Design a protein around this ligand. Structure first.
Ligand SMILES: [Zn+2]
Ligand SMILES: [Zn+2]
Length: 186
């Protein structure tokens, strides 16, 4: 039985473009070249495809932002700047796929992403095909709630439920903690 990893800080939920741009600029102002944030995204699972509904940025153990873009009529300009900011790193798992998706859906270019599975394969010197949960178990010795119920819930629904918020925040948080873990190994 492995302990369950959960974001323990404050979750800042933003579903309006202006509010989101303001918070994003605030993040940009508090960070500098070399800094990193935990990053992740969610979206609901005939002919039409589902677009990114939520973007998570965990700047620290005490604060994680959830940007409900599916509820925004215009993509947050401040969020766009932050994401395209090469000075700030975004750590995650399967994050190149996130970048691709962001470009396709909103023509937003995620800059300076850090694929944690590659960092792990090179540091831990192992050739493994990972899942975020699997990486948390091996690196953090913890577990992640991953039942379809929440993982595959309708992320475009407003508002996000308390379970959705904690799950989305925890996925970004896991990225930040794994990044710190691997980046400071000795
Ligand atoms: Zn993800
Ligand atoms: Zn996720």
């Amino acid at each position: 039985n492995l302990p369950f990893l959960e974001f323990p800080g404050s979750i800042v939920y933003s579903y309006e473009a202006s509010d989101c741009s303001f918070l994003s600029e605030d993040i940009s102002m508090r960070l500098s070249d070399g800094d990193v944030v935990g990053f992740d995204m969610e979206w609901p699972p005939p002919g039409k495809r589902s677009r990114v509904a939520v973007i998570q940025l965990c700047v620290s153990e005490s604060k994680c932002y959830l940007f409900h873009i599916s509820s925004m009529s215009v993509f947050p300009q401040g969020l766009k700047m932050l994401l395209e900011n090469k000075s700030i790193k975004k750590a995650g798992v399967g994050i190149e796929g996130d970048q691709w998706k962001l470009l396709r859906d909103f023509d937003v270019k995620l800059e300076s992403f850090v694929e944690l599975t590659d960092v792990a394969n090179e540091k831990l010197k192992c050739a493994e095909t990972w899942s975020l949960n699997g990486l948390v178990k091996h690196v953090l010795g913890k577990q992640l709630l991953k039942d379809k119920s929440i993982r595959c819930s309708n992320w475009s629904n407003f508002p996000l439920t308390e379970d959705q918020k904690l799950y989305a925040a925890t996925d970004a948080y896991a990225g930040l903690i794994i990044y710190q873990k691997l980046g400071n190994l000795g």
